[PDB]
Structures are given as C-alpha cells and as structure tokens.
Symmetry: none
Subunit: 69 residues, 3 copies
Amino acid sequence: GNVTADKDGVADVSIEDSVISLSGDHCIIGRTLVVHEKADDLGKGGNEESTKTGNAGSRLACGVIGIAQ
Amino acid sequence: GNVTADKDGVADVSIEDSVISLSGDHCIIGRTLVVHEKADDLGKGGNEESTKTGNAGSRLACGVIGIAQ
Amino acid sequence: GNVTADKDGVADVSIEDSVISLSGDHCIIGRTLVVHEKADDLGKGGNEESTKTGNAGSRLACGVIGIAQ
C-alpha cells in the first residue's frame, strides 16, 4: 500500500510504516574523569547481520571504546 | 492499506503503523568520576540480526564501552 | 485498513496502530561517582532478532557499559 496522497496544506507531516528516533543534549560537567578497562575475549565467531539499518552515532563491533561521545 | 489522505490544514500530523521514540537532556554534574571494569568472555558464537532497525546513538555489539554519552 | 482521511483543521493529530514513547530530563547532580564492575560470561550462543524496531539511545548487545547517558 503506502499511498500517502496530499492536495494542499502548509507544514503537514505524514509518516507511514517506518522507525524514528530523536534525542537531546548530553552535557556532563566535572573536574576529573578517570577510566580503567581490561577486556579479554570479546568475540569468538560471532556472526552478525544488518539490512536497512541506521544509527546516529559511531557504529562498531567488538570494541573497547573507553570514552564515547 | 495505509492510505493517509489529506486536502488542507496547517500543521497536522498523521502517523500510521510505525515506531517513534524521543528523549530529553541528560545533564550530569559532579566533581569526580572513576570507573573500573573487567570483562572476560562476552560473546561465544552469538548470532545477531536486524531489519528496518534504527537507533539514536552508538550502535555496537560485544563491547566494554566504559563511559557512554 | 488504516485509511486516515482529513479535509481541514489546524494542528490535529491522528495515530493509528503504532508505538510511541517519550521521556524527560535526567539531571543528576553530585560530588563523587565511583563504579566498579566485573563481568565474566555474558553471552554463550545467544540468538537475537529485530524487525521494525527503534530506540532513542545507544543500541548494544552483550556489553559492560559502566556509565551510560
């Protein structure tokens, strides 16, 4: 299906079968930020997959990022 | 189906079968932030999948991120 | 089905079969934030799946995040 007709109209929105995601600020104030990590065996034959997939950030697989943003 | 007709109208919204998600600020004030981690065996043949999937952040699989944002 | 007709109208909303989720601020004030973690064996062949799935944050699987945001 998914016809989505329209004849006029200022500033209208139509959203058929889809996926939407938003977010806001992520302020973090401080004076000292210390991190220690010890990863040992993350993946051992881990199959993966994706299709029509999105992401508003840093895609990754089997990582030890430490401090993201 | 999913017809979604319209003839006029300022600033109207129509949302058929879909998924929507929002969020707000995530302020975190402080003076000291210390983290210690020890991950050992996360994945051991973990199949995964996705289709028409979204995300408002940092996608990942089998990680030891430490401090996200 | 899912017809969703309209002829006029300022600022009206129509929501047929879907999923909606909102949130607000998440302020956290403090002076010291300390975290210790020891994960050992998270996944051991854990199948997963998704379809028409959304998320307003950081998607992940088998993680030891430590401090999210």
